[PDB]
Amino acid sequence: SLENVAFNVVNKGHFDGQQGEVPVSIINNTVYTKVDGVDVELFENKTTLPVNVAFELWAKRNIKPVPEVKILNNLGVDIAANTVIWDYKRDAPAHISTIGVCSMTDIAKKPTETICAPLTVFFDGRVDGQVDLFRNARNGVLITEGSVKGLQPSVGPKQASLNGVTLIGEAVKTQFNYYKKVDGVVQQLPETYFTQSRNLQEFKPRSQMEIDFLELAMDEFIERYKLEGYAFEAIVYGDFSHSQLGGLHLLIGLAKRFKESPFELEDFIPMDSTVKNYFITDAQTGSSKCVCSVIDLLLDDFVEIIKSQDLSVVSKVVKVTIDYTEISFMLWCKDGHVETFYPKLQ
Amino acid sequence: SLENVAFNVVNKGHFDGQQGEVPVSIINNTVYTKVDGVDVELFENKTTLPVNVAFELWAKRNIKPVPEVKILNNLGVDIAANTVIWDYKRDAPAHISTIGVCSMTDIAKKPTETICAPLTVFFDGRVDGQVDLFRNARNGVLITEGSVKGLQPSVGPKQASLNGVTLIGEAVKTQFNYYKKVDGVVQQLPETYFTQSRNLQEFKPRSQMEIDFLELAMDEFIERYKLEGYAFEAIVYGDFSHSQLGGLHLLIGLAKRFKESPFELEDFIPMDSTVKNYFITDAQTGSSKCVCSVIDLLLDDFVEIIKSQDLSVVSKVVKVTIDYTEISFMLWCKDGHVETFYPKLQ
Amino acid sequence: SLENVAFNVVNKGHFDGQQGEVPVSIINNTVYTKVDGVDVELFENKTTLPVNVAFELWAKRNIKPVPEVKILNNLGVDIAANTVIWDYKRDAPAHISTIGVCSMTDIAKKPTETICAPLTVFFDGRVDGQVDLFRNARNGVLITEGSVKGLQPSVGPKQASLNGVTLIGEAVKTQFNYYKKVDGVVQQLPETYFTQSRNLQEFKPRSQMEIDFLELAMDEFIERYKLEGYAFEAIVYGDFSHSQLGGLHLLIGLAKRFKESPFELEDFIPMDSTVKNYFITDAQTGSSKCVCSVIDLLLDDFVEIIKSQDLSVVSKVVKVTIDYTEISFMLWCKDGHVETFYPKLQ
Amino acid sequence: SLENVAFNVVNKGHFDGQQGEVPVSIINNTVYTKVDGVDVELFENKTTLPVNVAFELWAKRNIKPVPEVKILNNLGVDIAANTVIWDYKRDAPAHISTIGVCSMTDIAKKPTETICAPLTVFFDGRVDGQVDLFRNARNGVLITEGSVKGLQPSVGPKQASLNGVTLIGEAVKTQFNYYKKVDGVVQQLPETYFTQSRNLQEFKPRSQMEIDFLELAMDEFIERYKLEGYAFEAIVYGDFSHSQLGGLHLLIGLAKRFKESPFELEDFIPMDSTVKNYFITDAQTGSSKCVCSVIDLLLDDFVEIIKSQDLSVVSKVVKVTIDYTEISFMLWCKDGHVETFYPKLQ
Amino acid sequence: SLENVAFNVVNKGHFDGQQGEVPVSIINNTVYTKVDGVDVELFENKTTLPVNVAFELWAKRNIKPVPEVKILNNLGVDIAANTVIWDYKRDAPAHISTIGVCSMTDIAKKPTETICAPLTVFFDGRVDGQVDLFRNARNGVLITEGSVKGLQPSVGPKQASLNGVTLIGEAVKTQFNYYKKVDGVVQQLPETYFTQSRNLQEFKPRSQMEIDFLELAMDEFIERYKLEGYAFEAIVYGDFSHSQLGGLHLLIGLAKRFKESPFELEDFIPMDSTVKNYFITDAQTGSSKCVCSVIDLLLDDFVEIIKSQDLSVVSKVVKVTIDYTEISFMLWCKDGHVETFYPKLQ
RNA sequence: UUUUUUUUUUUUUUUUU
RNA sequence: AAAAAAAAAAAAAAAAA
């Protein structure tokens, strides 16, 4: 019920299954409630769904730590079992359909129905009975905080999303063990690097090499870590000396530049992905690049990736498995040295 | 509940207080429900109220024969007790607020509360307990199908509105006795004429004089009923010889002209009122008047009204009480005969 | 392309695959095009889909005689192969998804993909290669104007829908052979009666018995056809003596009453179905019923159905296969004669 | 007039009653004006009112220091006399109706009419003649910058709202004397505490003990002010060790935690109230509480309140009058020391 | 095409003339594209134009450094030749019509057509062939990065707008030479000062005098630069002692105040102009002025302007050519010293 | 195959510095 | 010597057709 959902939102912050109703008015893709005689905005519809449907899906969103939407997209998750994963990047549900959540978006009441067999249903092992549901599911992805009997786990990212906040949990557990089944067979998930899902304005280093990068100059950091000949001066630090921006494909370099000279990052595809494309304009020098692909790889991981390459190649498309998906990089070596190594995904 | 109201609408045609819910989607001021997987329109909001509020009020509208909205407006009715009077002319509720109907529009749960004391509340005597409520009400209007002990009745119009259809009931009773209280005192409603609330394209005579008017010509009808000197050729029949349309202030004359030559009626204030103003354009001769006051009086009643006037006055404003309200007519006469007689101020 | 689709609409009335573009402006859920410098309305979106998606689907609607939407609904058709069936009752596409029509609504490019196997795909044998496509389909419905090798046909209704006009074709063939496959097995479609899909204001009899019903009085027609004891006075002709309308469950009776006393038909679920529920208000007597189940069976077929029943049962659920679906009727009889006969559950 | 209101907005920043007009276009709940041939957004309607009505009310808003909307709500104010109080928290007018401001929302021209008698009309003593209007008003609230002859004053909060900015005025007077009349009797307003209406990101201490709280650690501040046994470690400082966040019911503690590690405050009821409920998510540890009641009391005032309670009770509901309204707290104690103290019912 | 424009946006960040289409849905004045099965917002319309037209104009905007919109407005530019100048202040195209850009907004395909002759067409000398187009244009404005044969250049502002960012270019050239033709005659543009187009929260001094103003106190700066008698205590620094704010007509003084005490700036006309008018409310002292004219002149330039005035006049209107337009300053003096100096008509 | 594309360098052209 | 506008080239791919 719309009014029951609004009652739950106003009295508990989200849908908690409580009984009750409040006066609700819907106008201009917005849900209002009457508190002491005046209408108060409860929800503004930023989705393509009907305002009431999107409102009830938002109220019933998962408020526990959940995998980042990019991780679920890379695993081919099409739907979530008895829960709503909210995509805070898009301000919309991460999946078009639901299972036992919303009568308007439900394709089934349980993930065991025939309609859910072709779909990769996301199962949460923290919910009672969902591990057994995944065991019987033809296609699905299961996340657990611990071990599963008879199943080899895949250790995922250290961080997860909690109410739109990507964090490495201390009071709560955000590291999950990932399992996948395709056509009823448990797949072995490849060894992967994981993006750190950090922000430009609140960037915090997570390794000693990152601290050195943030505090040392270009020359000292490159000399200290023996990173000569891999074009770190352009790939990471960026070249703000021409009309077209050069490099800057690591968010750590973007944050380092933003610390001294804040710039603009136009996100023309506002979603959650392993590789993000930005229309970046440098407000200090005027350097701009219409498409700058930025990947939030740990600097140690990127160093290992770029040092694992073969430098004696004119040009090569390099496949790196990041966030459980194959990210293709455009290696551009020349005369035995790297000239450019940027993420080309998205 | 929105879903329960929609369930009642799809299973009973209107809100009947049944339990159950159906999936509902709201978009573009329209209520949809999903029948067999496809969205089906249930309600298009044509009011200034929020779409869900207007949908709930429309579903809970009175489906019994009710007084025409113009009658209630002339009686000063400000609100209805535990019911919704739907104004089908405006496709909106007849009153801004409700009593114990919709949480968003309610000012009280019962008409006995102090908020409803100053307002003139409409009480329906066919609903159990409403006569006693009207007895204790400070201001109110009561309609009953029969007599009320200690209250002298006021016989109202023969016709009443049934689901937007104005009809004289045969299988159902559409004639009510009207009782009004102002400041706790049972008022005496004046003796009034009543408009027939007929349509131009569905006009049906309700008297022998009207039949003769429709079938007999101008001169024959005027001579037969001794209507010389009252300017019936212009006031009722209408003048189409000049670019500015003359007379045509009775719906019977408009019906007679429409029978021979259809014209255009631009209702620039589409509401229910005793006197209606139209932008008439004659498609045959090109005669047009921007404001033409048309009143749907019985032809016998109008003849009696015009014959009860004093003809020895050049200009005189005639006050006629029609539909429980005083309608002002401007009477122009010369040489002891009527020259012009239409509702004044147009 | 939106502009190419609008170009096809303005130059051919619909999408014909022609090349060219016209200026298009979208505002207020409406598509406009610029003709001689002024904006002209091309399409108003009455669906729940985005205006551009609905416009593109409407342009690519099937303009050939197609089965009525109720027939495809009863056959369980979930999607159409490389065509759009437009539901003119709802002014919306008959199916939420498409196959190789609209990138926004397409789930596949061809009906053979794995996503279309669980669905019942509608195939039109008048399009080359669709019969073999149906032969390869796990679930599907095929209509043909002629015979199909190795398949036993099921003769459908004499009428079909042509641009929203339900007609029995003379210049074109509107009678189709129906074939159904469920889980790869050709099904034997049941022997069915077919509704005539006639209108109240444009009702035309299709049999001599219907002619007699329309012209003869109640008693003369009942005595002529030996229809005594089947309560034809109530079920078909209808009863308007009480405030609650009785009977009026056959569209021919509604048409006969409308011929003499026009009344209001409130379609509170405006969609295409074998049984239609109306909020009928008799404008002459005031009799009204909130839910009136009206089925447009041929009068001869309904007479055969009512005479094929066993009269010596108090209450019995009567199952009739109409329009390829089972319609359940309420049969109340007393003293070996019918008292009421209406579609159950209304 | 809409054009005159827009003229006043573009030439003076608000409605000043000047004469003149500017071109105005209304589209998508937005008011535009044409400046040198290009449309400029003047107002976006975030209210449930019509766009032009909300625009006129926003132009005619009070630009003088006015009491905070929570103070007026706690005093029972339903309407303001000849002025508009703008609720900047909701971006909407604080009251549904007006007195002599907007013809669309006016219920009267002057507060002396009968309709305003049952309502608690807000009067401003800084406007000439409103003190006498309050004297003759049945129900009303009067604010003055000085003394009123014969009326005992209630000193209000030091801060007031000035164009949506809450401040303690230096060049302007923001402290008002409050008077209330209920049913014609001048009420004695209770002695109350007042919330400081401070922000999280712009928190500024207003007392020495607040400064000590912000600079000193938990143990030092607790020991210095003899606050052992009042559970200040959880109530104010907050506990972030478990998944469910504990305490953090004073805005000063939230500000202290924000100064070190920023977190997210989801205000699911964005209005002005003495007690605010937030969906709190700690971005550093992962602690989260769906509903966290935060009250912005002076730390000295809160310490006095907590020291005025009786500690020898297991569970007790504490009634504290704050911002002219009774705020209820749960007081849980064990072994003669406080275990929990939060506003009741959250 | 809408789909091609969206494909260009998602693949290159802007319209680059690529071939290809993506699925697009338009709803609620917003453009969405489907990426991996979920709708992603691409553009939200804040213009008065249709959503698709505004989306096409925004995608085809100029992404190279361009003159600020105020400069083009002061030059009388009505339209741009084969390009879209985006007004990021209004989030709308700077000009109503286009030339060979969008079919819905085009008045011509080339600037040589007769319709463009009366209009001042903006030409970009960096685009090939536009200098010759300006040479044959009746009315136009040409900007070049270098010399033009036979034409005397007018050196413009050092800064330009790049993707909505105003900057003095280092990697790009932001200083242009301005040429204007009126009725086919090359005009000599007046010698003018230029506003620095700085922001309050990101103010950076561009001269030694500005540095001294920001660091030194008011008295020290006034004494050092011999600025006694020019009322710099009010005009630049501002007065906050009274309820009405005094002076504060230079953005540098507003920035100095914002550094020590952040306040509110209500931009009630959000557009680009040489003189900006703000509703400034001081959060610390409570001083507010409904309309405050603020001009972003270099402090050295303003000092030269105020020292070039004739002090022996009581009231005098000063005409200053700033940003190629004549800004009217109101000068009040007493006893041979400046009392007040603000742009007139506020 | 075709056409277009890809946040590398390289020439060639061209203006303007 | 640049710079930028306009081409082409080396290379690995991505489509679609």
Tab-separated table of C-alpha atoms in Angstrom, chain B residues 30-292:
chain	number	residue	atom	x	y	z
B	30	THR	CA	-3.585	9.289	-14.518
B	31	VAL	CA	-4.263	6.131	-12.506
B	32	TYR	CA	-3.487	2.806	-14.181
B	33	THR	CA	-3.997	-0.773	-13.052
B	34	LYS	CA	-2.407	-3.944	-14.412
B	35	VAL	CA	-4.966	-6.371	-15.850
B	36	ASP	CA	-3.358	-9.522	-17.285
B	37	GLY	CA	0.020	-7.799	-17.482
B	38	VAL	CA	-1.024	-4.648	-19.379
B	39	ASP	CA	-1.724	-1.278	-17.771
B	40	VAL	CA	-5.364	-0.193	-18.056
B	41	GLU	CA	-6.508	3.368	-17.406
B	42	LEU	CA	-8.738	3.730	-14.348
B	43	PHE	CA	-8.972	7.493	-13.831
B	44	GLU	CA	-7.721	10.680	-15.481
B	45	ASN	CA	-7.394	13.576	-13.044
B	46	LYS	CA	-9.262	16.607	-14.384
B	47	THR	CA	-9.265	18.434	-11.034
B	48	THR	CA	-6.746	20.688	-9.298
B	49	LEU	CA	-6.365	18.067	-6.553
B	50	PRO	CA	-3.563	15.483	-6.485
B	51	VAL	CA	-4.225	12.517	-8.744
B	52	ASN	CA	-4.547	9.955	-5.942
B	53	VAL	CA	-6.728	12.277	-3.841
B	54	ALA	CA	-9.029	12.996	-6.784
B	55	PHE	CA	-9.142	9.286	-7.651
B	56	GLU	CA	-10.178	8.393	-4.097
B	57	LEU	CA	-12.822	11.141	-4.055
B	58	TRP	CA	-14.182	10.025	-7.434
B	59	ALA	CA	-14.373	6.386	-6.340
B	60	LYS	CA	-16.275	7.412	-3.191
B	61	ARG	CA	-18.665	9.693	-5.090
B	62	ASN	CA	-22.383	9.453	-4.397
B	63	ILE	CA	-23.944	7.011	-6.871
B	64	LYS	CA	-27.481	7.544	-5.540
B	65	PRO	CA	-29.763	10.246	-6.990
B	66	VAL	CA	-28.473	13.515	-5.555
B	67	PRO	CA	-29.522	17.159	-5.920
B	68	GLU	CA	-27.981	18.998	-8.840
B	69	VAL	CA	-24.844	20.923	-7.908
B	70	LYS	CA	-26.502	24.235	-8.804
B	71	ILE	CA	-29.239	23.580	-6.227
B	72	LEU	CA	-26.651	22.946	-3.510
B	73	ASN	CA	-24.664	26.027	-4.552
B	74	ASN	CA	-27.781	28.205	-4.375
B	75	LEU	CA	-28.520	26.758	-0.923
B	76	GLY	CA	-25.065	27.792	0.284
B	77	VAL	CA	-23.917	24.214	0.886
B	78	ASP	CA	-20.208	24.317	1.731
B	79	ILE	CA	-19.557	20.626	2.456
B	80	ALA	CA	-21.256	17.227	2.426
B	81	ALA	CA	-21.526	14.953	5.463
B	82	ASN	CA	-19.830	11.560	5.002
B	83	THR	CA	-20.286	11.599	1.222
B	84	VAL	CA	-18.805	13.068	-1.953
B	85	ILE	CA	-20.927	15.043	-4.400
B	86	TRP	CA	-19.210	14.744	-7.778
B	87	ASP	CA	-19.602	17.713	-10.127
B	88	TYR	CA	-19.783	15.993	-13.506
B	89	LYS	CA	-19.861	19.344	-15.317
B	90	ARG	CA	-16.377	20.109	-13.961
B	91	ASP	CA	-15.305	16.451	-13.513
B	92	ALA	CA	-14.300	17.473	-9.995
B	93	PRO	CA	-15.729	17.148	-6.480
B	94	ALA	CA	-18.434	19.722	-5.819
B	95	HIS	CA	-16.792	20.818	-2.547
B	96	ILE	CA	-13.183	21.520	-1.615
B	97	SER	CA	-13.271	19.663	1.714
B	98	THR	CA	-14.928	16.478	2.952
B	99	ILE	CA	-16.159	15.047	6.253
B	100	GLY	CA	-14.940	11.532	6.998
B	101	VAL	CA	-14.190	10.536	3.404
B	102	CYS	CA	-10.578	11.201	2.378
B	103	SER	CA	-7.728	11.826	4.809
B	104	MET	CA	-6.166	14.466	2.550
B	105	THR	CA	-9.370	16.518	2.168
B	106	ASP	CA	-11.029	15.802	5.530
B	107	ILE	CA	-11.548	18.660	7.951
B	108	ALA	CA	-13.438	16.408	10.386
B	109	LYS	CA	-14.514	12.812	10.878
B	110	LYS	CA	-18.082	13.787	11.832
B	111	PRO	CA	-20.118	16.928	11.064
B	112	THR	CA	-20.637	17.514	14.808
B	113	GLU	CA	-17.085	18.806	15.289
B	114	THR	CA	-16.479	22.512	15.834
B	115	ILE	CA	-14.854	22.978	12.416
B	116	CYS	CA	-18.107	22.051	10.635
B	117	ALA	CA	-20.253	24.283	12.870
B	118	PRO	CA	-19.911	27.491	10.768
B	119	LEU	CA	-20.140	25.635	7.445
B	120	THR	CA	-23.459	24.734	5.831
B	121	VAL	CA	-23.290	20.940	5.764
B	122	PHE	CA	-25.295	18.908	3.260
B	123	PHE	CA	-27.186	16.119	5.028
B	124	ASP	CA	-28.833	13.287	3.089
B	125	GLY	CA	-31.954	12.058	4.865
B	126	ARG	CA	-31.794	8.715	3.057
B	127	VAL	CA	-28.654	7.888	5.072
B	128	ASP	CA	-29.395	6.570	8.557
B	129	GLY	CA	-28.857	9.064	11.366
B	130	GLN	CA	-28.380	12.112	9.134
B	131	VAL	CA	-31.741	13.670	10.040
B	132	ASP	CA	-30.726	13.682	13.708
B	133	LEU	CA	-27.321	15.087	12.735
B	134	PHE	CA	-29.042	17.889	10.812
B	135	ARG	CA	-31.325	18.543	13.791
B	136	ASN	CA	-28.295	19.254	15.999
B	137	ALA	CA	-26.329	21.040	13.250
B	138	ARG	CA	-25.942	24.808	13.494
B	139	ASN	CA	-25.923	25.276	9.703
B	140	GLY	CA	-27.053	22.594	7.290
B	141	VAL	CA	-29.223	21.582	4.360
B	142	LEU	CA	-31.253	18.371	4.549
B	143	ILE	CA	-32.907	16.452	1.713
B	144	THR	CA	-35.453	13.726	2.417
B	145	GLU	CA	-37.617	11.497	0.253
B	146	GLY	CA	-40.467	11.969	2.734
B	147	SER	CA	-41.655	14.131	5.611
B	148	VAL	CA	-39.660	15.112	8.699
B	149	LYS	CA	-41.376	15.363	12.078
B	150	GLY	CA	-41.716	18.992	13.140
B	151	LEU	CA	-40.118	20.361	9.951
B	152	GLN	CA	-42.233	21.825	7.157
B	153	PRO	CA	-40.951	20.539	3.795
B	154	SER	CA	-39.900	22.465	0.709
B	155	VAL	CA	-40.696	20.451	-2.411
B	156	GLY	CA	-37.660	20.703	-4.659
B	157	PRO	CA	-37.043	19.962	-8.330
B	158	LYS	CA	-38.594	16.883	-9.893
B	159	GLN	CA	-35.216	15.956	-11.404
B	160	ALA	CA	-32.035	14.861	-9.641
B	161	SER	CA	-28.539	13.852	-10.736
B	162	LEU	CA	-27.805	10.113	-10.925
B	163	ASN	CA	-24.182	9.330	-11.861
B	164	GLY	CA	-24.077	12.511	-13.927
B	165	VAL	CA	-27.448	11.824	-15.586
B	166	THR	CA	-30.105	14.393	-14.716
B	167	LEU	CA	-33.407	12.527	-14.790
B	168	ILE	CA	-36.904	12.417	-13.344
B	169	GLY	CA	-36.875	9.081	-11.577
B	170	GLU	CA	-39.413	6.319	-12.152
B	171	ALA	CA	-37.753	3.275	-10.572
B	172	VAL	CA	-35.996	5.597	-8.088
B	173	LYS	CA	-37.132	8.716	-6.247
B	174	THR	CA	-35.567	11.962	-7.482
B	175	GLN	CA	-37.872	14.478	-5.757
B	176	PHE	CA	-36.657	15.578	-2.326
B	177	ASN	CA	-37.959	17.767	0.475
B	178	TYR	CA	-35.402	20.470	1.249
B	179	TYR	CA	-34.745	21.740	4.775
B	180	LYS	CA	-32.260	24.481	5.637
B	181	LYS	CA	-30.914	25.657	8.990
B	182	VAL	CA	-28.939	28.877	9.452
B	183	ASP	CA	-27.311	29.466	12.853
B	184	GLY	CA	-29.421	26.717	14.407
B	185	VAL	CA	-32.759	28.084	13.140
B	186	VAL	CA	-34.853	26.149	10.632
B	187	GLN	CA	-35.271	28.626	7.785
B	188	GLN	CA	-38.268	28.829	5.455
B	189	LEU	CA	-37.157	28.254	1.875
B	190	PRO	CA	-38.960	30.573	-0.573
B	191	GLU	CA	-41.329	29.380	-3.259
B	192	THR	CA	-39.169	29.080	-6.369
B	193	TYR	CA	-39.232	28.096	-10.003
B	194	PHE	CA	-36.952	25.246	-11.033
B	195	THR	CA	-34.819	24.863	-14.136
B	196	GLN	CA	-35.310	21.606	-16.021
B	197	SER	CA	-31.571	20.960	-16.586
B	198	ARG	CA	-32.201	19.734	-20.130
B	199	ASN	CA	-29.678	19.392	-22.947
B	200	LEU	CA	-29.674	21.049	-26.357
B	201	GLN	CA	-29.213	17.829	-28.347
B	202	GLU	CA	-31.480	15.723	-26.088
B	203	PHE	CA	-34.202	18.324	-25.475
B	204	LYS	CA	-37.612	16.806	-24.695
B	205	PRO	CA	-40.737	18.897	-24.008
B	206	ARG	CA	-42.167	18.601	-20.503
B	207	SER	CA	-45.434	20.444	-21.212
B	208	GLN	CA	-48.048	20.939	-23.914
B	209	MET	CA	-46.910	24.534	-24.452
B	210	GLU	CA	-43.365	23.314	-25.125
B	211	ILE	CA	-44.666	20.738	-27.616
B	212	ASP	CA	-46.628	23.446	-29.430
B	213	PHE	CA	-43.565	25.709	-29.380
B	214	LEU	CA	-41.459	23.021	-31.043
B	215	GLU	CA	-44.015	22.039	-33.684
B	216	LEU	CA	-45.932	25.273	-34.339
B	217	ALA	CA	-44.279	28.192	-36.108
B	218	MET	CA	-43.537	31.643	-34.694
B	219	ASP	CA	-46.787	33.473	-35.445
B	220	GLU	CA	-49.055	30.473	-34.835
B	221	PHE	CA	-47.598	29.793	-31.384
B	222	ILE	CA	-47.608	33.486	-30.449
B	223	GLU	CA	-51.252	33.948	-31.469
B	224	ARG	CA	-52.439	30.669	-29.926
B	225	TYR	CA	-51.059	31.414	-26.448
B	226	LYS	CA	-51.827	35.174	-26.477
B	227	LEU	CA	-48.134	36.097	-26.301
B	228	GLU	CA	-48.232	39.315	-28.343
B	229	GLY	CA	-46.289	42.282	-26.995
B	230	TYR	CA	-43.949	40.167	-24.846
B	231	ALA	CA	-41.241	40.092	-27.560
B	232	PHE	CA	-41.240	36.300	-27.822
B	233	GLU	CA	-39.923	36.599	-31.392
B	234	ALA	CA	-36.600	37.834	-29.965
B	235	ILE	CA	-36.425	36.803	-26.294
B	236	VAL	CA	-37.307	33.150	-26.920
B	237	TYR	CA	-37.063	32.551	-30.668
B	238	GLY	CA	-34.011	34.758	-31.174
B	239	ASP	CA	-33.004	37.241	-33.861
B	240	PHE	CA	-30.438	36.134	-36.455
B	241	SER	CA	-30.686	39.059	-38.888
B	242	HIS	CA	-27.717	41.074	-37.574
B	243	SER	CA	-24.107	40.135	-36.894
B	244	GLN	CA	-24.848	40.399	-33.160
B	245	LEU	CA	-27.265	37.678	-32.076
B	246	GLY	CA	-30.441	38.945	-30.417
B	247	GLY	CA	-32.337	37.314	-27.581
B	248	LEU	CA	-32.201	33.506	-27.488
B	249	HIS	CA	-32.184	33.427	-23.682
B	250	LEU	CA	-34.273	30.254	-23.248
B	251	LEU	CA	-32.923	26.767	-23.876
B	252	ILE	CA	-36.169	25.871	-25.659
B	253	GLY	CA	-35.485	28.514	-28.306
B	254	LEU	CA	-31.941	27.216	-28.716
B	255	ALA	CA	-33.342	23.696	-29.128
B	256	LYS	CA	-35.855	24.848	-31.744
B	257	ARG	CA	-33.112	26.639	-33.685
B	258	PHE	CA	-30.769	23.645	-33.329
B	259	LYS	CA	-33.456	21.363	-34.762
B	260	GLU	CA	-33.501	23.341	-38.023
B	261	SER	CA	-29.847	24.499	-38.077
B	262	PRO	CA	-27.189	23.298	-35.605
B	263	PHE	CA	-24.881	25.971	-34.190
B	264	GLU	CA	-21.893	26.206	-31.838
B	265	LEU	CA	-22.044	26.567	-28.047
B	266	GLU	CA	-18.767	27.668	-26.455
B	267	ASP	CA	-19.209	27.130	-22.704
B	268	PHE	CA	-16.314	29.262	-21.496
B	269	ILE	CA	-17.219	28.586	-17.849
B	270	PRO	CA	-17.989	24.837	-17.830
B	271	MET	CA	-19.785	24.574	-14.485
B	272	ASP	CA	-23.336	24.018	-13.229
B	273	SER	CA	-25.332	27.205	-12.644
B	274	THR	CA	-28.939	28.344	-12.872
B	275	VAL	CA	-28.019	30.918	-15.544
B	276	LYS	CA	-25.504	29.769	-18.159
B	277	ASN	CA	-23.461	32.068	-20.398
B	278	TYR	CA	-22.523	30.837	-23.872
B	279	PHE	CA	-20.561	32.116	-26.861
B	280	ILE	CA	-23.131	31.344	-29.551
B	281	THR	CA	-22.062	31.314	-33.202
B	282	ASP	CA	-24.805	30.701	-35.760
B	283	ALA	CA	-23.407	28.533	-38.551
B	284	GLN	CA	-26.223	29.458	-40.955
B	285	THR	CA	-26.442	33.269	-40.850
B	286	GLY	CA	-23.203	34.126	-39.047
B	287	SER	CA	-24.966	35.827	-36.135
B	288	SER	CA	-22.867	35.596	-32.985
B	289	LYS	CA	-22.961	36.880	-29.412
B	290	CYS	CA	-19.975	36.564	-27.088
B	291	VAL	CA	-22.130	36.302	-23.933
B	292	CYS	CA	-25.664	34.896	-24.139
